[PDB]
Amino acid sequence: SKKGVGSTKNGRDSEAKRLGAKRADGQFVTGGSILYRQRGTKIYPGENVGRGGDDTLFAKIDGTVKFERFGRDRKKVSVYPV
Template structure:
């Protein structure tokens, strides 16, 4: 009996399977034991639902490097401080979203970048008409404060300066435009007179 159990344990068989097919009284012949083992494995190989073992790859597959590195900083934030002098087109503030809004003499780009539209001095301020907004503007003069009164006209720069040199002043006074130099204005006047002469007078209503 102990010999049968040892053989069953080595072969991984159930003792009930062996005892059902064999007489365990006395010594077991070798051919009888081999026949029992063969019957057991033949029953296991019969068609039916069976387990399938799949061998998976032991090497990690290559993937994209989306999260393997950090991107470069975008250099957002303040570029010109309060009172800094700026020129036309210079960037004042870089941001994502409109945390700051453009004020007087300033504008906002497609990527929410605020830049100067006029040369002047940077001002960070709030407007009573927009209490929830923080504004960035450009003042024309160093002592000018923003915002200006809502009912007053905006301060504008026309690009005109007084000429102290008399020679340059006389030259500027005698300067003529390009159209005047080439006689284009005179041609336009003659053309307008010719068109007016060819037009027929409107018929007068009969009395």
């Protein structure tokens, strides 16, 4: 014999988006290349690097990325041309 149970009403979750570092420290990069995919301002951009529509960090010039500390707690990302 059996007993009937159901109604979990929990089984859904969205398709998870790729977020994170897509270039490493010291990488040569190209003009227009993304460096970090964040969601909200985790890292403020520095020189030669912009901020996208959905807070994306993109390299304006081809160069070498460097990650640095900004202030007490925050990070900064920058591009140095070679």
